[PDB]
């Protein structure tokens with residue numbers, strides 16, 4: 001048809017590209033460099049947890065370095081693909097790869113924190129350097145597999161002109177099941193681990209309270225004991241609970257000030273000595289020793305119990321909120337991407353416009369994610385402050 005009023009010539013969108021550089025691309029590249037430099041040279045930050053965390057910082061750095069800048073060309077020159085043709089499947093592949101790896105890294109981290117709560121007795125038996133490298137490798141294999149349909153299939157190609165996009169027609173299956181594997185599955189897992197963590201912390205605080213009153217009750221049992229035999233087992237009941245309460249937390253392998261967990265080492269040592277008296281038969285002498293156990297209880301143990309529960313609870317809450325924001329900002333993209341495949345009434349043209357926008361809410365979500373996470377750690381936070389002032393020694 002002929003419509004001369006159809007002056008639908010796309011205006012210049014350079015100001016949006018400049019704003020994504022300033023507000024998204026630079027914070028992504030800068031923020032993940034800091035996290036990488038920190039784990040790299042700051043010798044006090046080099047352990048298993050961070051090597052996995054560094055891997056995440058790498059994935060997010062690669063997003064802002066190879067995915068995000070070429071995504072600007074989607075914006076500057078709206079119609080066509082400026083780069084060579086083989087760069088199109090390469091770019092799309094790197095996009096799905098690095099974006100998926102970031103989401104799955106957080107899923108794994110969540111599981112580790114829950115495991116660290118449930119079973120703190122995992123000192124280099126696992127959660128070591130070998131364990132670190134295995135889960136790093138797996139996450140990448142998962143994200144490689146999810147991303148690999150894109151280059152294997154490719155974008156259809158006559159003129160050597162291509163439009164770099166995943167259409168509903170050609171990648172409908174991938175747009176649907178590729179989102180489930182990359183987002184909604186690690187989302188479901190993180191929802192499950194969330195409630196499991198609440199149960200773990202409540203069950204842990206409960207057990208500690210039981211250990212506490214076990215110590216105190218048996219103290220009165222000892223103090224009010226006329227017989228010898230009931231002193232001996234009242235002491236061994238204390239010894240079991242003390243070890244029980246101590247084992248609800250890793251050793252101080254970890255740390256510059258007081259270590260309340262050491263109180264259990266002292267307490268048990270006193271119990272054993274008092275238990276030697278009970279065996280010899282010196283009951284009156286043993287009861288006096290048991291009264292001295294209270295000094296250890298008042299000094300170390302009482303503060304330890306509130307220390308453990310409060311600290312584990314706190315670290316749990318903040319980790320949940322930051323991981324919640326990550327997922328929440330990735331929500332508008334993947335929900336839209338799904339409805340693009342499952343809704344046939346919606347205008348695909350404008351439903352694609354929302355995709356091209358929501359992807360930047362996700363990009364900045366992945367990009368600044370390790371920074372926001374590491375900033376609640378003092379060693380990282382102090383390291384950053386020295387880096388931004390260009391100080392290395």
Ligand SMILES: CC(C)CCC[C@@H](C)[C@H]1CC[C@H]2[C@@H]3CC=C4C[C@@H](O)CC[C@]4(C)[C@H]3CC[C@]12C
Nearest residue numbers: 021025026029030031033034387388389390391
């Ligand atoms: C065209 C666009 C993408 C420019 C990219 C921005 C890059 C080149 C610039 C902008 C801000 C810069 C960062 C600013 C802060 C620091 C602290 C310094 O101790 C280490 C390098 C680091 C992390 C810089 C690395 C390079 C950096 C990320």
Ligand SMILES: CCN(CC)C(=O)[C@@H]1C=C2c3cccc4[nH]cc(c34)C[C@H]2N(C)C1
Nearest residue numbers: 095096099100174175178179182355356359
């Ligand atoms: C606006 C257009 N772009 C960029 C070219 C996308 O829609 C990208 C397509 C993706 C995508 C499609 C289909 C399945 C998937 N799993 C994981 C991703 C994914 C990542 C996801 N990236 C982040 C955006």
